Amino acid sequence: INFYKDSYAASASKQDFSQDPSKFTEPVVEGLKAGAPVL
Amino acid sequence: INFYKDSYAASASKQDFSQDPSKFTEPVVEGLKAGAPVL
Amino acid sequence: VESIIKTATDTVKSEINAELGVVPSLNAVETGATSNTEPEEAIQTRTVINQHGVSETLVENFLGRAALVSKKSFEYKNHHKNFFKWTINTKSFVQLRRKLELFTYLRFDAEITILTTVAVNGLPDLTLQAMFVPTGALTPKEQDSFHWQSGSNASVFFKISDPPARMTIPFMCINSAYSVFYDGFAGFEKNGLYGINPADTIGNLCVRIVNEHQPVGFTVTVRVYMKPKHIKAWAPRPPRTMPYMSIANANYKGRDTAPNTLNAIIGNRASVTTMPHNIVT
Amino acid sequence: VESIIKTATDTVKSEINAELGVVPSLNAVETGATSNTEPEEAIQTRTVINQHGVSETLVENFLGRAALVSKKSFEYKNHHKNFFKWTINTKSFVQLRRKLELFTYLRFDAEITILTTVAVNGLPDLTLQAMFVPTGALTPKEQDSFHWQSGSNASVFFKISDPPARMTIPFMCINSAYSVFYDGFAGFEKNGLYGINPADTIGNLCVRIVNEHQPVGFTVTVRVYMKPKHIKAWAPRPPRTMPYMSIANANYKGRDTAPNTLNAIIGNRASVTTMPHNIVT
Amino acid sequence: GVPTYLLPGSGQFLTTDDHSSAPVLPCFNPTPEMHIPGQIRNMLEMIQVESMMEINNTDGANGMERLRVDISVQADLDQLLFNIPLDIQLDGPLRNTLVGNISRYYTHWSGSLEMTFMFCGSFMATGKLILCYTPPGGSCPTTRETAMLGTHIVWDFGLQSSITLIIPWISGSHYRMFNSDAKSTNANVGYVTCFMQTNLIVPSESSDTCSLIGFIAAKDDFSLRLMRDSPDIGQSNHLHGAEAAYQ
Amino acid sequence: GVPTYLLPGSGQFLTTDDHSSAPVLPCFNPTPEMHIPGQIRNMLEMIQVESMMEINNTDGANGMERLRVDISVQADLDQLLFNIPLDIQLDGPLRNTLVGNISRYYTHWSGSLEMTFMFCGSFMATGKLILCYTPPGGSCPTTRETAMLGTHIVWDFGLQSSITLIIPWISGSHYRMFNSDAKSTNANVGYVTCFMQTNLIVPSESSDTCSLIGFIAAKDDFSLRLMRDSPDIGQSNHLHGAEAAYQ
Amino acid sequence: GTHIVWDFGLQSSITLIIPWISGSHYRMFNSDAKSTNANVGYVTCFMQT
Amino acid sequence: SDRVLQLKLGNSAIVTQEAANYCCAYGEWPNYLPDHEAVAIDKPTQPETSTDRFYTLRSVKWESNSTGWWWKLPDALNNIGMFGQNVQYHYLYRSGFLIHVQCNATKFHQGALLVVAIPEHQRGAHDTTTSPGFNDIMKGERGGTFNHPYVLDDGTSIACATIFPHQWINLRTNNSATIVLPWMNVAPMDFPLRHNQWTLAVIPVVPLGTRTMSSVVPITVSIAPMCCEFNGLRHAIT
Amino acid sequence: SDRVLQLKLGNSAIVTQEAANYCCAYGEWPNYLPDHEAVAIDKPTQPETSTDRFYTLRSVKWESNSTGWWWKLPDALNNIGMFGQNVQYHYLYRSGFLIHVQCNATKFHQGALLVVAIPEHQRGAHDTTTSPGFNDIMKGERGGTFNHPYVLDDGTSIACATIFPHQWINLRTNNSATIVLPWMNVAPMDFPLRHNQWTLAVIPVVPLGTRTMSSVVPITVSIAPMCCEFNGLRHAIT
Ligand SMILES: CCCCCCCCCC(=O)O
Ligand SMILES: CCCCCCCCCC(=O)O
Numbered sequence A, B: 001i002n003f004y005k006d007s008y009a010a011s012a013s014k015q016d017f018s019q020d021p022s023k024f025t026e027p028v029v030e031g032l033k034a035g036a037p038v039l
Numbered sequence C, D: 001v002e003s004i005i006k007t008a009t010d011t012v013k014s015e016i017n018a019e020l021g022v023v024p025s026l027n028a029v030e031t032g033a034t035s036n037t038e039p040e041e042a043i044q045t046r047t048v049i050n051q052h053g054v055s056e057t058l059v060e061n062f063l064g065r066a067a068l069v070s071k072k073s074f075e076y077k078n079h080h081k082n083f084f085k086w087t088i089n090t091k092s093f094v095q096l097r098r099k100l101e102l103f104t105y106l107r108f109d110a111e112i113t114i115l116t117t118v119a120v121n122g123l124p125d126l127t128l129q130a131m132f133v134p135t136g137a138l139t140p141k142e143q144d145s146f147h148w149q150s151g152s153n154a155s156v157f158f159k160i161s162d163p164p165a166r167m168t169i170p171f172m173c174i175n176s177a178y179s180v181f182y183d184g185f186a187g188f189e190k191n192g193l194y195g196i197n198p199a200d201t202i203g204n205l206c207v208r209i210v211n212e213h214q215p216v217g218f219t220v221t222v223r224v225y226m227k228p229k230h231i232k233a234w235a236p237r238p239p240r241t242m243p244y245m246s247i248a249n250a251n252y253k254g255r256d257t258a259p260n261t262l263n264a265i266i267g268n269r270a271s272v273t274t275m276p277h278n279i280v281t
Numbered sequence E, F: 001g002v003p004t005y006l007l008p009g010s011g012q013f014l015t016t017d018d019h020s021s022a023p024v025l026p027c028f029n030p031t032p033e034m035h036i037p038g039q040i041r042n043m044l045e046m047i048q049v050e051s052m053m054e055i056n057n058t059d060g061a062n063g064m065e066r067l068r069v070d071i072s073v074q075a076d077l078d079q080l081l082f083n084i085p086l087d088i089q090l091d092g093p094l095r096n097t098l099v100g101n102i103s104r105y106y107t108h109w110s111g112s113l114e115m116t117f118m119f120c121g122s123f124m125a126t127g128k129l130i131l132c133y134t135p136p137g138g139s140c141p142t143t144r145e146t147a148m149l150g151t152h153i154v155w156d157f158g159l160q161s162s163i164t165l166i167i168p169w170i171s172g173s174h175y176r177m178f179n180s181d182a183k184s185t186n187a188n189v190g191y192v193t194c195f196m197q198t199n200l201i202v203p204s205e206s207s208d209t210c211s212l213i214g215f216i217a218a219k220d221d222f223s224l225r226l227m228r229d230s231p232d233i234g235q236s237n238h239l240h241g242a243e244a245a246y247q
Numbered sequence G: 001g002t003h004i005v006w007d008f009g010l011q012s013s014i015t016l017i018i019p020w021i022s023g024s025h026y027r028m029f030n031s032d033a034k035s036t037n038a039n040v041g042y043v044t045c046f047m048q049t
Numbered sequence H, I: 001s002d003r004v005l006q007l008k009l010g011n012s013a014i015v016t017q018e019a020a021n022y023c024c025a026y027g028e029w030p031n032y033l034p035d036h037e038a039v040a041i042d043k044p045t046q047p048e049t050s051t052d053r054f055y056t057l058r059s060v061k062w063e064s065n066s067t068g069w070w071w072k073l074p075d076a077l078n079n080i081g082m083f084g085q086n087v088q089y090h091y092l093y094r095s096g097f098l099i100h101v102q103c104n105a106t107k108f109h110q111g112a113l114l115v116v117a118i119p120e121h122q123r124g125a126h127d128t129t130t131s132p133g134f135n136d137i138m139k140g141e142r143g144g145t146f147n148h149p150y151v152l153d154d155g156t157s158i159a160c161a162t163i164f165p166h167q168w169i170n171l172r173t174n175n176s177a178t179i180v181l182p183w184m185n186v187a188p189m190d191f192p193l194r195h196n197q198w199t200l201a202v203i204p205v206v207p208l209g210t211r212t213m214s215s216v217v218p219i220t221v222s223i224a225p226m227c228c229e230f231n232g233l234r235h236a237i238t
Helices: C060-062 C093-098 D059-065 D092-098 E062-066 E098-105 F062-069 F096-105 H079-087 I082-087
Strands: C067-076 C084-089 C103-120 C127-134 C154-159 C165-168 C203-209 C218-236 D067-076 D083-087 D103-120 D127-134 D154-159 D167-168 D205-209 D218-236 E001-003 E071-072 E082-083 E106-110 E111-120 E128-132 E150-157 E164-169 E189-196 E210-219 E222-226 F004-006 F069-072 F080-085 F106-110 F113-119 F128-134 F151-156 F162-167 F190-194 F209-218 F223-227 G003-007 H004-008 H012-016 H069-073 H091-101 H110-119 H166-170 H176-181 H198-208 H219-233 I006-008 I012-016 I069-073 I090-102 I110-119 I167-172 I176-181 I199-211 I217-232
Touching: C060 C093, C060 C218, C067 C084, C067 C093, C067 C203, C084 I167, C103 C154, C103 H110, C154 C165, C154 I217, C203 C218, D059 D092, D059 D218, D067 D092, D067 D205, D083 E128, D103 D154, D154 D167, D205 D218, E001 I167, E071 E082, E098 E106, E098 E210, E128 E164, E150 E164, E210 H110, E210 H198, E210 I217, F096 F209, F151 F162, F209 I110, F209 I199, H004 H091, H004 H219, H012 H091, H012 I069, H069 H219, H079 H219, H091 H110, H091 H198, H110 H176, H166 H176, I006 I090, I006 I217, I012 I090, I069 I217, I082 I090, I082 I217, I090 I110, I090 I199, I110 I176, I167 I176
Parallel strands: E001 F004, G003 I012
Antiparallel strands: C067 C218, C084 C203, C103 C165, C103 C218, C127 C154, C127 C203, D067 D218, D083 D205, D103 D167, D103 D218, D127 D154, D127 D205, E071 E210, E082 E189, E106 E222, E111 E164, E111 E210, E128 E150, E128 E189, F069 F209, F080 F190, F106 F223, F113 F162, F113 F209, F128 F151, F128 F190, H004 H012, H069 H198, H091 H176, H091 H219, H110 H166, H110 H198, I006 I012, I069 I199, I090 I176, I090 I217, I110 I167, I110 I199
């Protein structure tokens, strides 16, 4: 519980478990299917 | 939460967002319309 | 006219204008009103949802800061003989003074913080007493006079090893607000002081070292900070430009050379067509 | 594509594969995509319910540590004359710097902790003042100048005997995030500094000993730690390999001999068929 | 009792902290509030009032002469009359204004500004001027053909004595900083210039040199951040009477 | 008041603590958030991107030459082409990679790794290679007949230019440690070796020596624990300009 | 100007469209090649690689 | 429509055919003291028409080198008519003020006067640490003159004086300024002989100039107290 | 199917018969500035086809000892066509970029180029504490060359550069690389003459080689700004 009036004073926020690796690992316009030849 | 018995001992009051600039910017008896000639 | 404002106003997109009888960019300064020309009427604008906050400029925050109002050094030794008296005022330190003087009237409670430091002429952990002596009450004459028994006056005892002492003085003016400026005289005769409203008289802050003197002397410095809160302010004023001269008046002289000289507040440039920090590419 | 991940992915059992037209182990690195071959497609796997957590690698935790950002020693005596000024930056200490530089942009609030230590040239329990002087504000010129009255600047007074002072500086960039790297110049002319975004200018941290000097001199050291929190990060980057040379740029030279030499980052082995720590039985 | 532990920061005195504290006078009853004209609740209300720019900040101009710009009947065409440095952090015509003074107690700013000019010549004097705002990037324009390419307003003198030039908020970043480096990309606002659109024309009995008074103010889309001590006031000694307060 | 008592730990400054603390600037309004491409929320996202292994870390190989392994047309059969030390704690081909660099900020690891190799010879060049992963326990294999007994993939050069060798997580314990003793049972991962399955065969006008570029990355079954300072950076003096920040 | 970058390959041919871009509805087959009602512009070909 | 105006109070009236609307200080209007804000318990006297009317002071001449003029309220009226008598016979007073500043010339003259009503205008002295004396402040009906209008004789600035209720008299545009002032103080009533709630300042920011026949160009001030109330009756401090 | 591709913008089009799919940086696509993220209040100009089209820069020659090339955006285009004119006449700009790198050879040639788009690629200088100067950074349409590609001329490494949006041109596989870049900055718009959002780097990780007839093998770059917007109109800083 943050007792200060400014929210930026609060303790850390370690609850954001969202991820999207594909923006780094698969930034290709056409999705690559499992075993289908990529090219 | 103020634990003292006198209210003047409380922490600051930073929640008054009311304003009325017109008392300083337009203290004229007759309201001036947007694009209409002021005089 | 009054309304709740939490963010800067948004901008609405605007189109071309060519209307007879409509001239939003023309105004009449003589009326005393500030121009009401909107950006949307001066140029073609786009729509902008403005999320910029305006809370840091709330008067409560602008003035809500602990500022130095008193600083006093004295010698603690076998004999200011181990104590001092300060006629309270908020006009001795210019940073706080200039800000308070941006307003004509002010109503607020005041949080007072007292910071003490010592130096040998190890450091002793002394006990000090700060007694609030209201107008008309007797002030101490010695480090040990009976006055310090403080039967009714509020006194606070603190050690140099503890955090700074702190307490709140309520809004105590005999009027509904303090007069930051006072265009009048304090008495019924003609020789009274000008510019000092009696109504805003707080009193004296008397501070002593409680401990008897040690075999050696020390220099003790007491700093007092004040932070206004639960603030209400009225009638803003032109900011001070000339350096302050006295705590008792608004007398002025100006710096010897610009900026802020009586003859010229802003520093000079070669001419009205000279651009000072012109970008040279 | 986005989803909530709390544990490492499970493995599903797989069978023998002999399908024409299906070659999961073949890929095309040229597309820029990382191989999507799954363990289940490369070998025969068993089922494994993986309970391994992934919270210790959350960006908030990875960067959420108080790291040294400033260390300054000065002499406290009768005369840096009992105070110093530090133009804030996060590029002086390499451990923190390298981690922050794993990202292109960062948005976070910063918890600041100030640790003070003293040594005689017993130890005095001094009072210090750390004042935050924002860009454009005047910095103190003496241990006792009027600037320290701190009418508007935020100041924190603390004793050497108290726990380290601590406060949080909000995300204060004029943009939506700090630019860890900046491929541009800070001014409209051509002589400006390269690689320094003006937008990320914090200001100066001014620290003084409040006490007047003692009869003898002392060495006082002030260490400042910063811990980012409420973090958002964008566009990860190649980690620094060459030793840092300056706080003002990414200039490089490399170690005199591997590892991390400009000519060879990894240390040499005799040949591409030589196994360095080969198990000899 | 309750098991506790002290955190870093314990015992410190932060001048911007916000906590309740012991009342010195218990049971004190403050004077009843009374309505007073002119209450101000946000400093942004104050900077929206226009105040005079010291445009004629030149050697030879004393006191109030510095607050007005004199324009004369020209012999040549398209003449440059004056320009205004948009410096707020650095000293300049905008520094000692309501918006300038208050803004200097802060470090970051955002929003549109408005400059209003009132022609103070005689009724028989006529003329047309062009006021231009040039977004940053280059050198201040010195010819009307160049200045005219930026934001501007052509002003015709007449019954309505004043004209307003809006300096719209045009910035890449959300805010600009009051940085000591006037040429910084996060501080430079651009320029304002004024040229004759036609010419100041007056009859024999009207004065042939007339004055303009320029005002500036913030619009309600303005916002200020990061409070700091103002560079406009300082002291190197005790003020007269300060020490006497202890006697 | 409330009766309390201080516990051991009171007053300490733990660099990994997590508490709220006094806001320096009350009522400060941070700049509005804006969408920015490439947000990363967990470092595991970064190590799943494959990066180049410095396989040719040998004397005589300078700069980028160290990032590619040259293979030539062989005169003999079943020839060993190269091996890769799977050392992450100790310096080696895997150290300066995304997975290697980030993992070294931790002490424990678990999960499968993937090595992808792209053949960069000419279109007219053909060949078949065998990539093998040998779980720990013995000496690195030096003959194809031995390496072939472990986990492997036979790669045929063709339209699809790259092949992936999965190094499945095969460990007795849940995690392995980045221990300074490379031969420790809680650290050694085994070996990776590459042999000709057939031979590199090219026509007269195609270059007879071709390069391979090897990449490595973690799979999504990966996990890292126990944060520590990385051994990859250090300083023995003040950086240039550090002290000037105080002047 | 208007253009098409052509990569040689399986599909042997490339098409460059010369779109009708004229002020007037029609152009004339006038003997004066530099006339504003006749000149169509130019077509040029350069190596891209 | 907003250029012509007639003000009528008591047996007095004023018209102008060249006004510029008119200012109501802080958007307020004068009013009598309500029971919930009252302090003095004696029944007040509310003379109405005998005091709430226009009093015209002696004129001043606008010269080429004038620095400006000022009149403090209620001091300027403390010895004029029945308002003056009530002020002298009563310890306490309360009132608003309707101010009308007048100045005409020709269509060949130029000049601009800032007409501002300053609350609590505490004057400062120049180049000395000694505070202004009684005679430097209390000028009465004659009013005073500015020594350094550039800093409003108080170390601040006239440039920012527009933050106070005001109007301008720009010869080319108008010939009068009108400002309505409500009671302005931290107390419901006050002793009129030692404190001035408002100071009327008239300063030529743009000097008077012309090339036509020279004539004396006066500036005249007319002030009408509004909603006057007096308490604490006794003998006159005449 | 993912080997052939045609890109068409404005009056320009490009086809390739040997592509390798194409990269959308961070899985994003260019877009105009929405009202809820806007800062500059003047109505922007959106020239569309006159600026959102392919601009082909001068080619470079891939030699046996080449170290690599780089072009900064928008600098490389700040003086080309109508995009260049809008950039010079406006204080602010915003846009995405469609990048197409081209390089063909024969089935007897080998070589591999890393084609990577680096956000905020702040260059470092080699063996000196002096920061890079204006002319070391702003090369314009000609672009620059890498001194030490192994560490990306910034003390890091090309080995890990794959963390940035990229593709490869492996002669044996493809003859072109395509990357779509969205606006990448911490501000909604920026001054185009002093800051480069992206740096296009083309580095030969595997050198060009063959035993067939030697021929000049060029590398060509074509870049199309996307969703261009400009604010803060004035004169040209040509
Ligand atoms: C340190 C005690 C302060 C009590 C309140 C003083 C208010 C003074 C207001 C002023 O006239 O500027
Ligand atoms: C100690 C105060 C720190 C304030 C936040 C500084 C952020 C710097 C980010 C960077 O450019 O690496």
